[PDB]
């Protein structure tokens, strides 16, 4: 029957669509970045160079503004599953929590002022790592969404 | 609060996110729950949907709280913690003992039912002496 855990699952199901949207936006932005990078980077025209630089900066700013909501909402999921005493889901979700914590609080870039830095961005290694991370995160969020739906239905019917 | 924040950030009225950040979203929701007012109300259909359902929820919940409290204060109901003997064996807060050197203790001692075996175990492993020397005691 309806209970605290089922409501938690419903709310997480509603909020995981937002994470899916965020990761889809991430991959679209990184596809645009790849289209700019793999495409010739000649900057002979000052106007063209300025436009490309401002596009890169805008995309980086968008990604930076959009990261904290994802991590904090996933932390909300973890907190909810802790309070509801749903141990399995909390165990499945802790590793991503710690990965996000590490990612946000390490700043492997030597600059260590922004997660994504326009100057450090456009690097093939960093670009490809971000693309792969985003794709894996999208897969994980889809799987977790379907798992949450199944658990919600299971808890309701019983 | 989170949904209002998202809906107002990435689908703003068009500015509309300096109002209805996370902090001000929490504040708006809290002021709604407590039947107070608001220094800001959403202008977009999505934020307004969120606010409307939150308002309905708040109304129902406050009404229910007041009504059930009126019930509680109108009708006194004292529930006995115990309505059987198994309830008494499971409980450890309540202590129980018979009259020492009597037929009741002899009954519990030689018992074969599980519940009374558990009671006998407790009474034999009880500190201080649950047992008694007289009925009036």
């Amino acid at each position: 029957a309806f209970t605290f855990a089922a409501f938690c699952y419903m709310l997480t199901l509603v909020l995981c669509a937002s994470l899916i949207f965020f990761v889809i936006w991430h991959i679209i932005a990184f596809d645009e970045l790849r289209t700019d990078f793999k495409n010739p980077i000649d900057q002979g025209n000052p106007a063209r160079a300025r436009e490309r630089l401002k596009n890169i900066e805008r995309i980086c700013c968008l990604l930076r503004k959009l990261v904290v909501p994802e991590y904090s909402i996933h932390g909300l999921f973890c907190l909810m599953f802790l309070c509801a005493a749903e141990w399995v889901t909390l165990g499945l979700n802790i590793p991503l929590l710690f990965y996000h914590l590490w990612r946000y609080f390490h700043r492997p870039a030597d600059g260590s002022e922004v997660m994504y830095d326009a100057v450090s961005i456009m690097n093939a290694d960093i670009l490809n790592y971000c693309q792969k991370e985003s794709w894996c995160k999208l897969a994980f969020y889809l799987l977790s969404f379907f798992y949450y739906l199944y658990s919600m239905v299971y808890t309701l019917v019983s | 609060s989170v949904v209002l924040f998202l809906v107002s950030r990435f689908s703003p009225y068009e500015e509309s996110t300096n109002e209805f950040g996370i902090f001000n979203s929490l504040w708006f929701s809290l002021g709604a729950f407590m039947r107070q007012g608001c220094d800001i109300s959403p202008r977009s259909l999505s934020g307004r949907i969120v606010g409307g359902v939150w308002w309905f929820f708040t109304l129902i919940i406050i009404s229910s709280y007041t009504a059930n409290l009126a019930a509680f204060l109108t009708v006194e109901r004292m529930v006995s913690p115990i309505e059987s003997a198994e309830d008494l064996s499971k409980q450890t807060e309540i202590a129980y003992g018979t009259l020492d050197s009597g037929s009741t203790k002899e009954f519990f001692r030689r018992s074969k039912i599980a519940v009374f075996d558990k009671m006998w175990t407790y009474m034999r492993s009880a500190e201080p002496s649950v047992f008694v020397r007289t009925t009036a005691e």
Binding site: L11, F21 | F10, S11, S44, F57
Partner: peptide
């Protein structure tokens, strides 16, 4: 009802996002 309204609000926000993006790209 609350969960349904939250989901509907997300959906309507997505619709508004697409609509506004198209109208702005027109501009």
């Amino acid at each position: 009802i609350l969960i349904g309204g939250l989901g509907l609000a997300m959906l309507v926000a997505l619709i508004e996002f697409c609509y506004k993006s198209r109208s702005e790209s027109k501009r």
